Amino acid sequence: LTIEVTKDQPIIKSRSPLSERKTVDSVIRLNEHDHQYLIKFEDKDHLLFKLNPGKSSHIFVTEHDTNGIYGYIIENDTVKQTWKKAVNSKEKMVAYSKRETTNLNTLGITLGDKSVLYKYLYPNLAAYLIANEEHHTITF
Amino acid sequence: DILQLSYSDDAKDAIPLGTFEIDSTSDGNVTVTTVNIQDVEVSGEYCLNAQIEGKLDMPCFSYMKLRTPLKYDLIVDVDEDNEVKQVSLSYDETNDAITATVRYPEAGPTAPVTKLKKKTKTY
Amino acid sequence: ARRGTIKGRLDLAASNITGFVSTRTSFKLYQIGNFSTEYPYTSTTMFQDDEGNFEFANLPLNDGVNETTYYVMYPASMDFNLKPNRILIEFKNLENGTLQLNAFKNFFGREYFPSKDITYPEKLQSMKVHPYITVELLHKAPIRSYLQARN
Amino acid sequence: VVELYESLTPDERLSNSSDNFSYDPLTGHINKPQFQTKQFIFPEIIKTMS
Amino acid sequence: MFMYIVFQGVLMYIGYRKLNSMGLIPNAKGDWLPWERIAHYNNGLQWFSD
Numbered sequence: 374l375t376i377e378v379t380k381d382q383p384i385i386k387s388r389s390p391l392s393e394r395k396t397v398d399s400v401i402r403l404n405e406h407d408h409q410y411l412i413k414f415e416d417k418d419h420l421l422f423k424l425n426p427g428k429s430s431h432i433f434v435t436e437h438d439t440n441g442i443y444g445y446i447i448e449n450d451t452v453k454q455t456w457k458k459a460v461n462s463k464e465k466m467v468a469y470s471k472r473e474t475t476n477l478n479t480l481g482i483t484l485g486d487k488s489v490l491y492k493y494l495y496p497n498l499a500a501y502l503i504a505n506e507e508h509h510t511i512t513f
Numbered sequence: 514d515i516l517q518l519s520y521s522d523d524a525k526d527a528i529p530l531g532t533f534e535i536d537s538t539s540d541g542n543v544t545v546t547t548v549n550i551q552d553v554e555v556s557g558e559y560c561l562n563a564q565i566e567g568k569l570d571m572p573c574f575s576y577m578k579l580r581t582p583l584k585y586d587l588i589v590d591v592d593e594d595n596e597v598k599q600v601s602l603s604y605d606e607t608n609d610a611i612t613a614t615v616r617y618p619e620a621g622p623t624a625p626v627t628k629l630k631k632k633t634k635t636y
Numbered sequence: 637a638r639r640g641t642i643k644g645r646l647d648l649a650a651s652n653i654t655g656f657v658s659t660r661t662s663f664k665l666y667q668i669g670n671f672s673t674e675y676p677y678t679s680t681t682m683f684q685d686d687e688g689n690f691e692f693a694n695l696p697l698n699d700g701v702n703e704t705t706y707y708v709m710y711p712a713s714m715d716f717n718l719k720p721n722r723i724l725i726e727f728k729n730l731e732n733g734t735l736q737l738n739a740f741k742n743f744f745g746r747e748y749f750p751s752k753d754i755t756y757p758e759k760l761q762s763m764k765v766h767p768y769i770t771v772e773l774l775h776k777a778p779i780r781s782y783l784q785a786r787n
Numbered sequence: 788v789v790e791l792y793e794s795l796t797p798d799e800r801l802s803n804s805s806d807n808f809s810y811d812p813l814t815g816h817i818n819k820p821q822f823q824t825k826q827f828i829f830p831e832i833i834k835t836m837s
Numbered sequence: 838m839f840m841y842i843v844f845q846g847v848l849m850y851i852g853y854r855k856l857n858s859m860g861l862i863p864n865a866k867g868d869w870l871p872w873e874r875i876a877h878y879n880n881g882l883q884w885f886s887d
């Protein structure tokens with residue numbers, strides 16, 4: 374649905390199907406300017422989404438399951454797997470987070486004698502957990 | 514424990530790239546030996562494939578922009594049981610080849626707490 | 637098979653607090669020592685009575701030569717501050733055949749049992765458990781006092 | 788908590804000159820951090836953080 | 838007759854040496870942190886994601 378938010382009560386300015394009438398697991402926000410979105414359907418099917426006008430230059434998008442952490446790349450109006458990382462059978466991915474973008478203030482943490490340790494700023498990071506039974510090993 | 518490493522085009526085939534072996538010599542120390550590495554022309558963006566017959570098969574574990582003067586440090590990762598857990602690659606300036614290192618998990622602190630004192634019974 | 641059973645009662649009698657709700661305070665049990673269950677036992681209870689009884693039961697146990705099972709109970713109140721704030725539970729076999737109960741009064745962030753090498757270490761304080769385990773609010777600050785006031 | 792630093796040495800900007808180097812992540816010639824970690828003892832069970 | 842200026846100058850030395858060089862020196866590396874360059878890591882990539 375496309376809905377018009379106004380100071381008055383809204384109006385449903387559009388309803389329509391997606392390209393394939395399939396059940397959807399989630400949606401990941403792609404670029405504001407390019408007006409793209411990525412839809413992950415259950416059955417693990419990924420759909421590029423060109424919604425409306427709203428009236429090399431690679432893009433990388435990355436999604437998680439308990440089976441693994443996968444990573445995905447979009448080029449040429451198509452999605453391709455870029456790599457995979459599944460935990461083994463006994464294992465199970467548990468907890469995940471990405472790097473929220475940050476406006477920058479200080480490139481380094483200082484010391485008493487005006488000395489500086491240069492905190493590590495790499496933007497392309499995520500962190501995650503693995504828990505494995507009988508090992509009793511929370512791996513970070 | 515033999516590993517075979519190969520880049521693939523992901524449409525044509527997995528074209529082989531190298532072969533390595535993993536031996537557990539000491540009580541608790543594994544190590545890698547490069548039985549052979551087969552270098553051919555490499556340039557551009559490629560997806561990697563790693564397979565140890567028996568235990569492990571990571572078909573697409575990484576993706577890098579590769580070059581024929583291979584100058585990478587190949588971190589294979591192990592754990593308390595002497596079993597391969599992961600395979601990944603980083604860039605190190607000094608190798609002019611592929612050299613591989615086995616890695617143990619760099620165990621966490623288990624940071625301290627207050628302890629019971631020593632004969633605070635009659636003292 | 638013989639089981640354990642925790643008996644206890646938070647008083648709310650020395651206090652005159654009787655407009656309390658009884659649904660915002662929760663005791664919780666965990667197992668640490670000598671357990672063969674491929675997961676330590678755990679549980680959570682609510683109150684039983686206005687005078688405040690709480691009770692766990694069907695507790696698994698170790699059996700044989702002075703076989704110990706280490707439970708830990710978390711006395712807390714989200715409306716009060718409970719003076720114990722941590723409880724140790726010790727469940728050993730007698731050579732007579734009966735199972736001995738002992739509990740202790742730890743506090744947040746100290747080891748429970750000594751470090752296996754200290755000669756003659758200090759021992760935690762036990763508490764009289766004939767009637768029940770008797771948990772209490774803080775004498776001096778019974779209220780949790782979330783609200784800081786200016787001035 | 789783990790805290791990620793360019794160099795654990797007291798004064799070092801490891802490979803972060805930026806005038807025109809224009810590092811590539813896709814290739815993998817980026818710097819790699821050193822880390823320092825600690826943990827803490829907490830009274831109550833934590834569901835979720837942000 | 839230049840003894841008066843030679844004599845007086847060291848009294849300018851003593852304050853700068855003893856107290857202004859306590860923590861208040863320019864030209865040491867900790868004073869250029871506001872002026873430190875913003876490291877460019879991607880510069881052609883976005884990494885939208887979950």
Ligand SMILES: *[C@@H]1O[C@H](CO)[C@@H](O)[C@H](O)[C@H]1NC(C)=O
Nearest residue numbers: 668669670671704705706749
């Ligand atoms: C647990 O059992 C072992 C024997 O398997 C014994 O040495 C130990 O004292 C027991 N208690 C604890 C807390 O480990």
Ligand SMILES: *[C@@H]1O[C@H](CO)[C@@H](O)[C@H](O)[C@H]1NC(C)=O
Nearest residue numbers: 700701702703729730731732
């Ligand atoms: C208990 O401990 C006593 C300590 O003297 C020991 O003699 C006995 O064998 C143990 N057995 C049981 C069943 O508790």
Ligand SMILES: *[C@@H]1O[C@H](CO)[C@@H](O)[C@H](O)[C@H]1NC(C)=O
Nearest residue numbers: 730731732733734735736737
């Ligand atoms: C029999 O068990 C009781 C507790 O149930 C204990 O107090 C007593 O000492 C035991 N008998 C002997 C002879 O130790």
